[PDB]
Amino acid sequence: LNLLVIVVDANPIWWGKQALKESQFTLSKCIDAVMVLGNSHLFMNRSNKLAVIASHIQESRFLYPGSKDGKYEL
Amino acid sequence: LQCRNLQEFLGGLSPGVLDRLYGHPATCLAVFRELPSLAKNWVMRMLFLEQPLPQAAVALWVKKEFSKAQEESTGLLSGLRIWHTQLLPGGLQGLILNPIFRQNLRIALLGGGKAWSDDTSQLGPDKHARDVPSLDKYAEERWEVVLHFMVGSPSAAVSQDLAQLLSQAGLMKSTEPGEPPCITSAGFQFLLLDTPAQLWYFMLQYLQTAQSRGMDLVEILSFLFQLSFSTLGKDYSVEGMSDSLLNFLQHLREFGLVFQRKRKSRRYYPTRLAINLSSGVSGAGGTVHQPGFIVVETNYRLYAYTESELQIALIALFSEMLYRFPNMVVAQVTRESVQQAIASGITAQQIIHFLRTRAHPVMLKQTPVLPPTITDQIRLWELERDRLRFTEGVLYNQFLSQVDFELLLAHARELGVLVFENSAKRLMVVTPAGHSDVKRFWKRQKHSS
Amino acid sequence: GVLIECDPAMKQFLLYLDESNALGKKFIIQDIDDTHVFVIAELVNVLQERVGEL
Amino acid sequence: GAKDYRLQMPLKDDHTSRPLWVAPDGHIFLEAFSPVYKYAQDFLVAIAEPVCRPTHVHEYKLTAYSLYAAVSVGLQTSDITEYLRKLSKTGVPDGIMQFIKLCTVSYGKVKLVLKHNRYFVESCHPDVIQHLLQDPVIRECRLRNSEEETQTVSFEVKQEMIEELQKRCIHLEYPLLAEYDFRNDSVNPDINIDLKPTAVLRPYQEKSLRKMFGNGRARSGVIVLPCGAGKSLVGVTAACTVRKRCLVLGNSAVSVEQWKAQFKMWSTIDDSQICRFTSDAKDKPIGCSVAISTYSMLGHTTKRSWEAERVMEWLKTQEWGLMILDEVHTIPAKMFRRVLTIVQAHCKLGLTATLVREDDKIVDLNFLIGPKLYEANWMELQNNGYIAKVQCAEVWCPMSPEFYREYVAIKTKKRILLYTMNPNKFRACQFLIKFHERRNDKIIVFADNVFALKEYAIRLNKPYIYGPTSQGERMQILQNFKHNPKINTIFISKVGDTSFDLPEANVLIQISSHGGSRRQEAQRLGRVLRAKKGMVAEEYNAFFYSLVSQDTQEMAYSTKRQRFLVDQGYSFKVITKLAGMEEEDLAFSTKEEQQQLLQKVLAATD
């Protein structure tokens, strides 16, 4: 039983300057690496738990709290 | 009973077969979670990778103190056909995950091209939905009917494919042509075993003869490991199974591990026996299945708080019974009772662990099981027949010279026909099975002079 | 022969039966050491009743 | 193979909070883990005779005799059957209530009354005395040739059919309850005896005397209480409390000094009303009443006249009859008949700590001596400071092959003297002495034979005592282990006696377990193995081992000792391997020394 609590600094101004930079790496791959880390953590053991929080500029809203994709439904 | 732990049967599986078993993501997750934590993290490290990493990096990912506990994970990955070895174009032996195994783990973690096993078209609260304690009751009823069949009650509701299975696995020997099914000594040792150990011994000796009914080991073991990783509450469907899977699933219904509703139905309920199917030990003081019930006092006195004709027959096997009350049975472990269990064949670690398993909760903090006088005594009884042990043989005498007799001792020892030697009197006992080979050697030695 | 492993103080128990039984020529055919004796095959089950007397 | 008592015994819905289980052959099982254990213990002690007292669930047995004593105390039918209903998880069957009726309805079919030293027989209704005088044997030994009591028919009974009258009234099934009138026996006058408050008293001893005296009248009977643990205190206290007088008889010689020590400081009888008919004294029998005799060991005929003739005369006049008996499991069929013949006692006193008396199944001397009045809790006696923390542990040693070959050839008693002495056991016997030599503890090896233990002490230079020695010699040697604090060993024998005192020390052993002392050994375990200190601490310290040979037909007695040790609250275990005997400087290390012993044992006279 383990509990990873990812916190992703979703500054819309910073990732906005990153997406106007026209780089390779934008917010989509950031949140996708977050979700692949989350599914990996739930994947390593059955008892693991996950919670993903996104600090916005004015709010701490949580992100986290059939199988068409083929992944586990949960 | 050796515990395979998803390793002993899996080890030595056919090369064509090994690739095939990982052709569903259920099997890749199920072999993944069995792994030790080192091999676990290494597969999850090397998963997203197309290059055979050299051996130096794998040996160089580990701190120095843990090399003794490291080579087990590497060897377990290698023998289980995950890490197949490749070559970097110099001499560096590259290591790469089996792309069937790796691709189906990545299907288990990410999107996939297949569509899994669980299914439901849309059937809600089912017609005669079954209740969870009634699933417990069904498990108890069916598996105790099989156990009573082995014991030999008038409750013999086995449907004679299961009786043929019990005769084929070496448990109930049929002898004297006219339907008189006995119990082998393997059946008595099967009775005194734990319930997950009994069911897993059923599955091992069931798949030992899986070359009979058109069965394959791979799909059946994937279905067993699919059963024991399921939930009692949520309900399943059958659509997505072959017809030999239907025959195995209705034979499994006869086992009692799966509650169907109808034979032509589209639904099965994996029973509480099916979840605790695991190669292991149910405990040394208490069982998740049933709480213990036997109070073993220092008077050699068994107090069984359970009404059941099965367990009364088992306590009749390794003891002798005096009182029977509608809540309790009072039995005494006599020497002669264990020596009758010995006559069938019973080593008295079965007895002490039996009493420790069913230890009444007034024995909490009342340990008094540390010294067993009977176990030392039992070796002395066993010694009564060990005091005379059967065999056959020939003796060579008139041995003569001392250094010549030492060379003859190595001839019977290598072949395995030597029993006892004597260098002071020049005497050697040779079994009659290899008498035609020792004499020739002696003749050759004589010729050599 | 039949190898029988026993106790040094119990080896002479089977020797007394040799000089008393008049069934065959000789019961014990060969004596290796104090913990190893030999025997025509036939008296292990009979000794299991004699051991109770012993 | 098992009795079904499921249908005769009715199921009911109190399977949690009742302590009994009442099987229709009388047998009552008892949970000693429910909080009503004290009360059911009290009930079944009063009403049943016990069978087993293990740790968790005890087993009692309803006999006719314990029901008769439960009535004779004063319990009615409604009380006994009402609390068997109100204490049993399973309902009471029909055979047990039918047999309870046939033992409790009438308190006494025949009443025996002692007044003016006349043993009358009375009843409130004349029919039973009519049918009692119609019997041919009642005709044979009835006594012929000689207010405020309405509705009473009586007849006198001779002096020397009292035993035969009681046994015949047993056989006729019209039994007797002892009745004594203190006022009518006015001839014998009370003497002033003062109890000592400073002298200690015990809760169990109070329960025993409350079972004896009880409601008014003193009552004949058998008290089964610990020896070496205040057994002497109960008897001395009882005699003082009534103020009635009596002669106390002990078969054993030391006993004289043991009982006198209890009352020596606590009263003025030592220099006023003292008398000793044994040990050659004859101190004022002429007026000391209260005497100390030794059963039927004396009396004779011509040989001893005058002084020992008066050995049995001045006691029957000035002792009303609080008859006292001590150690009667060793006093076999023939001596109890002469005790009740030479003296008349209002009540019968039993001071024996053992359970069964004389170890004989066929004949029981218990009822002519009275009911078992009370049984004390050995768990409370041991965990307080009344007996040593006996740690029983059997030691089974292998049999030597050189001595086992000759065991088979002879079925005499020489094979016993040969089987008894084993060089494998002698090395263990010397190891146990060395194991306690560094701990300078009081250790004595016990051998059950004439002079078997004599050679065991001369070979290794240690003192020894046995039976045929001397009274003046054992007087100082016995004090050389408890009265005098000098650390030494010594080998003693059965001696037909128990030595007990105030010294705090412990430790004892056993070689032979098949002989004549294979009966008193039970009670010898409690008298010898005492505590290290006065009110000993709860912790254990005393040890007790037993050397038993292997494959020598000795388990016949080694099994019966397990039934007695579980009732004494002692820890029992089996240790067949000492593990450390070979690595010790002992004797008989080589095989040549063990061979020389064979030429001496067989040379010994048989």
Tell me which chain C residues have a C-beta less than 8 angstroms from the C-beta of D401: 7-12
Q: What is the CA radius of gyration of chain A?
A: 14
- Which two tokens mark D381? 């006696």
Contact at CB, B325 and D574, closer than 8 angstroms: no
Nearest to A70 among B29, B40, B107 (CB): B107
Neighbours of B388 (CB within 10 A): 22
Closest residue on chain D to C51 (Cα): D551
Closest residue on chain A to B34 (Cα): A45
Contact at CB, B323 and D2, closer than 8 angstroms: yes
The closest of D327, D273, D337, D344 to D115, measured between CA atoms, is D344
Tell me which chain D residues have a C-beta less than 8 angstroms from the C-beta of B324: 2-6
Alpha-carbon distance of D327 to D357, in angstroms, equals 9
- Which two tokens mark B223? 């279905």
Q: Does C47 touch chain D (CB under 8 A)?
A: no
Q: Does D399 touch chain C (CB under 8 A)?
A: yes
Exposed/middle/buried for D72, CB within 10 Å: 0-12, 13-18, 19+? middle
The residues with which D27 forms a beta bridge, in sequence order, are D61
Q: Choose, out of A2, A41, A72, the residue to mutate when testing the contact with B (most B CBs < 10 Å).
A: A72
Contact at CB, B326 and D6, closer than 8 angstroms: yes
* CA separation, residue B13 to residues B74, B151, D599 (Å): 18, 36, 72
Exposed/middle/buried for D258, CB within 10 Å: 0-12, 13-18, 19+? buried
State the DSSP H helix or E strand holding residue B254, giving kind and residue range, or none if neither: helix B243-255
Q: Does C38 touch chain D (CB under 8 A)?
A: no
Contact at CB, B303 and D57, closer than 8 angstroms: yes
Alpha-carbon distance of D25 to D33, in angstroms, equals 24
CA D349 remoteness from chain centre: 12
Alpha-carbon distance of D35 to D19, in angstroms, equals 9
The residues with which B258 forms a beta bridge, in sequence order, are B270
Establish whether chain A is in contact with chain C, requiring a minimum of 3 CB pairs below 8 angstroms.
no
Closest residue on chain B to C51 (Cα): B384
Neighbours of D43 (CB within 10 A): 24
Alpha-carbon distance of D496 to D327, in angstroms, equals 11
Q: Does D576 touch chain B (CB under 8 A)?
A: yes
Burial D170-204 (b: 16+ CB within 10 A, else e): eebebbbbbbbebeebeebeeeebeeeeeeeebeb
Q: Does D11 touch chain B (CB under 8 A)?
A: yes
Q: Which DSSP string corresponds to D116-173?
A: TTEEEEEESSHHHHHHHHSSHHHHHHS--------S-EEEEE-TTSHHHHHHHHHHTT
Q: Which amino acid is located at D331 in the chain?
A: I
Q: Does C46 touch chain B (CB under 8 A)?
A: no
The closest of B194, B195, B169, B197 to B183, measured between CA atoms, is B169
The closest of D72, D77, D106, D75 to D92, measured between CA atoms, is D77
3-class state of residue B437 by DSSP: helix
The residues with which D491 forms a beta bridge, in sequence order, are D445, D464
In SS3 terms, B161-202 reads as: CHHHHHHHCCCCCECCCCCCECCCHHHHHHHCCCHHHHHHHH
DSSP at D468: S
Tell me which chain A residues have a C-beta less than 8 angstroms from the C-beta of B113: 70
DSSP at D285: H
Of chain C, the end-to-end C-alpha distance in Å amounts to: 25
Contact at CB, D2 and B321, closer than 8 angstroms: yes
Closest residue on chain D to B328 (Cα): D15
Exposed/middle/buried for D22, CB within 10 Å: 0-12, 13-18, 19+? buried
Contact at CB, C16 and D399, closer than 8 angstroms: no
State the DSSP H helix or E strand holding residue D381, giving kind and residue range, or none if neither: helix D378-382
The closest of B331, B379, B335 to B358, measured between CA atoms, is B331
Q: Choose, out of D55, D56, D578, the residue to mutate when testing the contact with B (most B CBs < 10 Å).
A: D56
Contact at CB, C12 and D405, closer than 8 angstroms: yes
Tell me which chain C residues have a C-beta less than 8 angstroms from the C-beta of B390: 2, 41, 44
Tell me which chain B residues have a C-beta less than 8 angstroms from the C-beta of A71: 108-112
Contact at CB, C3 and B391, closer than 8 angstroms: yes
The closest of D261, D293, D294, D288 to D275, measured between CA atoms, is D288
Q: Choose, out of B342, B388, B390, B423, the residue to mutate when testing the contact with C (most C CBs < 10 Å).
A: B388
Contacts of C among chains (3+ CB pairs under 8 A): B, D
Binding residues of D for ATP: 225-232, 527, 530
* CA separation, residue B337 to residues B12, B319, B344, C47 (Å): 43, 5, 11, 20
Contact at CB, C9 and D408, closer than 8 angstroms: no
Alpha-carbon distance of D115 to D128, in angstroms, equals 21
DSSP at D464: B
Closest residue on chain C to D550 (Cα): C54
Domains located in chain C, CATH noted: 1-54 (3.30.70.1220)
3-class state of residue D585 by DSSP: coil
CB B307 within 8 A of CB B318: no
CB D492 within 8 A of CB D451: no
Alpha-carbon distance of B119 to D571, in angstroms, equals 64
For residue B441, the number of C-alpha atoms closer than 13 Å in the C-beta half-sphere is 17
Q: Which amino acid is located at D463 in the chain?
A: P
Return the beta strands (E) in B241-342 as ranges: 258-260, 268-270, 294-297, 301-304, 320-324, 329-332
Contact at CB, B429 and C1, closer than 8 angstroms: yes
Closest residue on chain A to B24 (Cα): A70
Contact at CB, C7 and D398, closer than 8 angstroms: yes
Q: What is the β-pairing status of strands D57-61 and D27-31?
A: antiparallel
Contacts of B among chains (3+ CB pairs under 8 A): A, C, D
Judged by phi (left if over 0) then psi (alpha if -120 to 50, else beta), residue D343 lies in: beta
Cβ-proximal residues to D140 (8 Å cutoff; 6+ apart), any chain: none
Q: Which DSSP string corresponds to A30-69?
A: HHHHHHHHHHHHHHH-TT-EEEEEEE-SS-EEES----SS
Q: Does B234 touch chain C (CB under 8 A)?
A: no
CB D56 within 8 A of CB D32: yes
- Alpha-helix residue ranges (DSSP H) falling in B80-230: 99-109, 132-151, 162-168, 185-191, 195-207, 217-227
Resolution of this entry, Å: 3.9
Smallest CA–CA distance, residue D212 to chain C, in Å, is 49
CB D566 within 8 A of CB D50: no
CB D278 within 8 A of CB D251: no
CB A6 within 8 A of CB A34: yes
CB B397 within 8 A of CB B426: yes
Alpha-carbon distance of B227 to B275, in angstroms, equals 7
Alpha-carbon distance of B411 to D581, in angstroms, equals 41
CB D2 within 8 A of CB B320: no
Tell me which chain C residues have a C-beta less than 8 angstroms from the C-beta of B429: 1, 3, 32, 38
